[PDB]
Amino acid sequence: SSPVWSEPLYSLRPEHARERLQDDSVETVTSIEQAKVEEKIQEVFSSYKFNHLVPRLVLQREKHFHYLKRGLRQLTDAYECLDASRPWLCYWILHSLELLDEPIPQIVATDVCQFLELCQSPEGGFGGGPGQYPHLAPTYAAVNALCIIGTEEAYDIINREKLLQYLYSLKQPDGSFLMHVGGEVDVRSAYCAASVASLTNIITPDLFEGTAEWIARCQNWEGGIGGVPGMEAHGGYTFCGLAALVILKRERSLNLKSLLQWVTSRQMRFEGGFQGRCNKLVDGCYSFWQAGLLPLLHRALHAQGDPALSMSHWMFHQQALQEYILMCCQCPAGGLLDKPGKSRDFYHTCFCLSGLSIAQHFGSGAMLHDVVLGVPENALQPTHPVYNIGPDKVIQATTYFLQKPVPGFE
Amino acid sequence: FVSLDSPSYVLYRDRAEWADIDPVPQNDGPNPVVQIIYSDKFRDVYDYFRAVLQRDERSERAFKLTRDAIELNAANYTVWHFRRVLLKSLQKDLHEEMNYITAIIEEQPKNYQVWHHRRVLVEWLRDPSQELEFIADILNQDAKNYHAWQHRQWVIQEFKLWDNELQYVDQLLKEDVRNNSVWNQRYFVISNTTGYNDRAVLEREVQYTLEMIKLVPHNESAWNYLKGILQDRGLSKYPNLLNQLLDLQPSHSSPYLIAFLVDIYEDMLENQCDNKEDILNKALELCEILAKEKDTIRKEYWRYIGRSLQSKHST
C-alpha cells in the first residue's frame, strides 16, 4: 500500500474536482458566494499535495493549547461583546482543553468554580456574569463546565433546589421554555433545560410535560428542525431538538427518516464540512451541530432494532470532515475557525474540535472503531453526543447527582 | 442626548447629575478567569448600571443609561429586561421606542435580544403596521437572516397578515431561487392558508417546482420542496411524477434526481407495488451508483439505504 509517511486524501482525489458547484449557468447571490468559498478551499487543499507525496495532516495541539490556556485567564476588550456569556467562554475553553487531553491545574479549576458561583443567581440558574439575571444559555454552559472539572467542589456549587424552581419559572403551557424571564422562546431552551436537569437529577414528571410534542412541531418539511414551529431547518436548532428528545427518551416523536436524510445532505460534497442550512455556506462549527446528529440517530435507530445500521461508521463522511477541519479550520497561531479567511475565536475552537472528535470515534454497544486521519497524535478524547462533554464526565456527574433526591419531590 | 462616540460624551463618574449614587464594581473574585479587560468607558457605564439595578431605580436617568449600556453590549439581556421594566414604569412612548429598536436591529440584525424586544413592543402596542416593511428592509440586506424570517412568521400568524406573503415569496424566489429560507416561507404560507390537500393547489405547486428544477437542475432547495409537499401522502402515490423524472434522467442525471428516484422506489416497495423484485433491483442499483460515483460524500448513507431496502423487501 502506501508508506507510513504519505496518506492519500479524499479531497485530493482527481475525481473530487467533479464535486465543484454546477450553477447551471444561472448565477444568484447564493451560487456566487458558494463558488467563492470553493475556489479558496481548492487552493487550500492543493497546498497539502505535492504530486504523489501527501504528508500526514497534523492537529497543532500545542498552538491550540497555549491559545486556550491564555484565554481561560484573560481576554482583550474584543470580547466585550461576550460580557453576558462568560460561562460560555469557560465551557468552550475547558471543553477544548478536555478534548486535547490537556490537564487543568487544581488552582485554575478552583478559580473557575468560584467564578461560576459568582455567576449563579439567587433565584436559581446562572447568568452571563456576576450579578446578571439567570439565562438558560449560560446556565447550560456553567453546568457543563462544572461537570468537565468534575470535582465534588464543582458539583456542589450548583444550587439544585433553586435550579429546578428556575426551570419551572420558564416553563410554558405549550411545552416550550423561555430562555430567561421575559425572554425569547425557541428550541435552544428545551435542550438547555433538559441537559442541566438530567445531569443534576432534578427532573420531575411534570417538568417536561408537552415538551417532546412541542419539539416535534419544530421539525419541518425539510426533515430538519427549526427554532420554532414553522421555521427553516437549522443545524444548531436540530441538534438542540434531537438531543433534548434523546434525554426525554422521546426520539420516536420525530420522523427519523426525513431527519436522517436532511442532515446527511448538509455535508458539503466539495468542502467536506457541514453547512447549517440548505444552500448556505460551510462553517466549521457545524462540524459538531450537524455531525453530532449522526451518533444520536444511530443510537435512536439502534434502540428500535434497525438491522441495517453500520457497526463501524457514522452515516456521514468521517474522513472528509476531518480533512476539512484539519486543512481548512486551523489558525497557524492557535485556535480554530469558521472557514479560511475568518479569524479565530473560542467558540469555533470548541466546536471544530468537538466535531473532529465525533468524526474520529465510532461506538455502538460493544463495538468501537476509530478513524484518526493524519499523525496518530491527532486523536482527541471522545465527546458525549448529547451533552458534548467527555462521556466519563457525564457518567461521573450523573452518578454523583443520582445520589441526591429530586428537590422537594418524591 | 449624547452618544458614547460623541465628542462631548462625559463618563458617568464625572456627571454631576449622577454624583448622588455610588457606582457598583463588578466582583469577579480574587483570582479571575475569562476576565475581560474592559475599556474605561465600558466599565464606567456598567459600574453605574449595576448601581441602578441594585437599587432598582426606576428613573429617567436610569432609562437613558440603558441606551449606553446597550451600545456597549447589545447582547446583555439583563440590560434589555431592565429597560423594558423602565418603559412601563415611566410610561414611555412606545412608538418612540419602536423607532429606537428599528435603528438598533439595523445595526445588529443577528442579535437575539433586539428582535425579542421588538416583538414585545409589537405585543404591547398590538400594532403590526410597520413589521412587514421593516422586515423586508432587513431581508433586503441579508435575505436569509433567520431572526428576521422568524419574526416575520410570528407577525403574520399572530395578526393574520397572509394576504400578500405569497407574492412576497415569489418576488424573492425570482431574485434568488436558491434561497432556502424563501422556499420554507412558501410552505409556511400555503400550509397555513389553502393547505396542500386542495389538489388544484398541489398541482400548481408541483408544476411550479418542476419548472424551477428545469431552469436550475442543481438547485437543491427546489428538489427538497418537491419532496416536502409530497412525502406525507407518499411519493409512490404520484405515478406520473416517476415517469417524468425517468425521462429527464438521461439528460439530467444529477444526484438530486437519482436520489429522488430512490425515494420513490422506497415508498413504492413500502406500499406493495407491483413488480416488487424489479423495483428493488432498480433501487439497489441506484444506491450503488450514488455511493460509488454520483454522491460519494454520502456513501455511508446510501449503503445504509441499500441494506435497509433488503431488510424490508427481499422476500
Binding site: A84, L337, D338, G341 | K110, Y112
Partner: peptide, 9 residues
C-alpha cells in the same frame, strides 16, 4: 481576516 458572526445567545 474577518470575525465570524456566529452567536449562541
Amino acid at each position: 481576516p474577518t470575525a465570524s458572526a456566529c452567536v449562541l445567545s
